[PDB]
Design a protein around this nucleic acid. Structure first.
Ligand code: MG
Length: 221
DNA sequence: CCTGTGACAAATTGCCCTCAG
DNA sequence: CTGAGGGCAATTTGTCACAGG
């Protein structure tokens, strides 16, 4: 039953750092954007509906959905084919009434959310909601960019490019760490908490790894 | 140069309780 | 009963020294 989340490939591949909680909210606006046209670009958020859709308590849910908002100040996203740096909101959010929050999306993002009828990413929210780690979030998010209908696919990604688009810590430049605190972690989270069955092999030129080749079956078979 | 691992610091997790309405 | 607050211990995340190929 989770609402199918349908995003521009543009989005799937862009450069931003958002928290777990924050990306969670990301999925929710773009849905309200999808029932929008010729838009105003304002979005409502209902605390009760959050803690039902993400299995939280009323009280904890209202922490997650407050802090996150304050830490959208500053947050940007860079678009590429291009070096076009954008910003998430224009006025901060607020709650006219008890429980509802009205955010104000930069309406110069609307077409970058509908993108193109040619190339776009889809998935259902049910897949992703038991992920704690966000980097795991971006990955499954891209991994779906390539899924063919039966739930399977293949892809090679390049380390210099994962670092940019997903915008990871500088200390991960050394691979020994990269594979410890990002690689084995995000493959373990996905292959545990989602309906996907992953594995990986490294692509090495010379004395250095450079690509990761991701390869996945829908666990449903 | 490459790597893996330990140890320490700094940020998250979910869980707890107060209080106003 | 709800949600706007304060606080938390345990684990998960970011860093870097050191040992060997
Ligand atoms: Mg929380």
């Amino acid at each position: 039953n989770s609402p199918r989340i349908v995003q521009s490939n543009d989005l799937t591949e862009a450069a931003y750092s958002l928290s777990r909680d924050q990306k969670r909210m990301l999925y929710l606006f773009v849905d309200q954007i999808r029932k929008s046209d010729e838009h105003d670009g304002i979005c409502e958020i209902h605390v009760a509906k959050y803690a039902e859709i993400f299995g939280l308590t009323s009280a904890e849910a209202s922490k997650d959905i407050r802090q996150a908002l304050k830490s959208f100040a500053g947050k940007e996203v860079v678009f590429y084919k291009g070096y076009e740096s954008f910003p998430w909101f224009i006025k901060p959010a607020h709650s006219p009434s008890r429980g509802l929050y009205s955010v104000h999306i930069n309406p110069y993002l609307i077409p970058f959310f509908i993108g193109l009828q040619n190339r776009f990413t889809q998935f259902r929210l049910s897949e992703t909601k038991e992920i704690t780690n966000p980097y795991a979030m971006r990955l499954y998010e891209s991994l779906c960019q390539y899924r063919k209908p039966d739930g399977s696919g293949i892809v090679s990604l390049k380390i210099d490019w994962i670092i940019e688009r997903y915008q990871l810590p500088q200390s991960y430049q050394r691979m020994p760490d990269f594979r410890r605190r990002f690689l084995q972690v995000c493959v373990n989270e996905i292959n545990s908490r989602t309906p996907m069955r992953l594995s990986y092999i490294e692509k090495k030129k010379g004395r250095q790894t450079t690509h990761i080749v991701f390869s996945f079956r829908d666990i449903t078979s």
